[PDB]
Every structure is written in structure tokens, then in C-alpha cells.
């Protein structure tokens, strides 16, 4: 599990990188599970973000180099929780899933 966090306010980045050919991914707000981002907050098509639930959610890394790290701007305590970085592959069982814990503490 990846552990990140900080005091509420400043941005935090949830690191996520994958291997192989460029492919689509989504971020889940919640633990990783069987199905693709059931509480999805960001979706990509491999090269671009196609949808985000909140404008605070940004992918500021180089997607073409498989850096799909999520930055949350203007963090709040309520952002705390488990997130899933899910990189989509062609099987049923072979998606790459990284679990990230986010801890945003009160100032
Ligand atoms: Na991968």
C-alpha cells in the first residue's frame, strides 16, 4: 500500500505508474475491488483525462510515460481514505491495481 498525506490545504499527490503500452486508467475513491472503479473520480483514455468528478483532481504527470499519479488540489480532511489506481487491461483479472491511503490531517 502507498501512504501519502499532509495537513489540509496544500496539494497532495497519490503516486501511480505502470508498465507496458500506454492504456486507459481510472482512479477510484475507495478500496480496490473486483470491478472497474465503482466510485470512479477520474477516467483517462491513455493520453488524456476524459472525465473528473471534481476540478481539484488533476493528473499532472506525463501520461505518455505511464505516470498517472493523482494530484488533489485544495485538500480537505474529508478527502482522507483509500483510493485505487486502476490501469485497464484486456483480461478479466489482469488490471494493475495500486492501493493508496490518503491522510489529510486537520490544521
Ligand atoms: Na501494468
Author numbering: 4 to 110
What does the paper say about this structure?
TIM family proteins exhibit a classical type I membrane protein structure with an N-terminal immunoglobulin variable Ig-like (Ig V) domain, a heavily O-linked-glycosylated mucin-like domain (MLD) and a short C-terminal cytoplasmic tail. Recent studies indicate that hTIM-1, with some other but not all phosphatidylserine (PS) binding receptors, functions as a common attachment factor for a range of enveloped viruses, including filoviruses, flaviviruses, HIV, etc., through direct interaction with PS of the viral envelope. The Ig V domains of hTIM-1 and hTIM-4, exhibit two antiparallel β sheets with the front and back faces formed by A, G, F, C, C′, C″ and B, E, D strands respectively. A hydrophobic cleft formed by CC’ and FG loops, located at an equivalent position in hTIM-1 and hTIM-4 structures represents the putative PS ligand binding site.
We crystallized the Ig V domains of hTIM-1 and hTIM-4 and determined the structures at a resolution of 1.3 Å and 2.3 Å, respectively, using the molecular replacement method. While hTIM-1 has only one molecule in the asymmetric unit, there are eight molecules of essentially the same structure present in the asymmetric unit of hTIM-4. Despite sharing overall structural similarities with other Ig V domains of TIM family proteins, hTIM-1 Ig V domain exhibits unique features that may be essential for its distinct biological roles. Most notably, hTIM-1 possesses a significantly short BC loop that is the most variable structural feature amongst Ig V domains of the TIM family. In addition the residues of BC loop carry smaller side chains when compared to other TIM family proteins. This structural feature coupled with the movement of FG loop of hTIM-1 away from the BC loop, creates a unique groove that merges with the PS binding cleft. Two residues (Arg 110 and Arg 86) in hTIM-1 (while the counterparts are Pro and Gly, respectively in other TIM family members) render the two walls of the groove positively charged. We show that the Ig V domain of hTIM-1, but not other TIM family members, interacts directly with the GP and more specifically with the RBD of EBOV in vitro. In addition, the single mutations R86/A86 and R110/A110, exhibiting 60% and 50% reduction, respectively, in the binding affinity of hTIM-1 to Ebola GP, confirmed the structural interpretation that the unique groove in hTIM-1 also participates in GP binding. Based on the above results, we conclude that all the three loops, BC, CC’ and FG, of hTIM-1 together constitute the binding sites to Ebola GP, of which the residues Arg 106, Trp 112, Phe 113, Asn 114, Asp 115 and Lys 117 are critically important for Ebola GP binding, while, the residues Arg 86, Arg 110 have moderate effects on GP binding. Additionally, we further identified a number of residues on these three loops, which are critical for the EBOV GP binding.
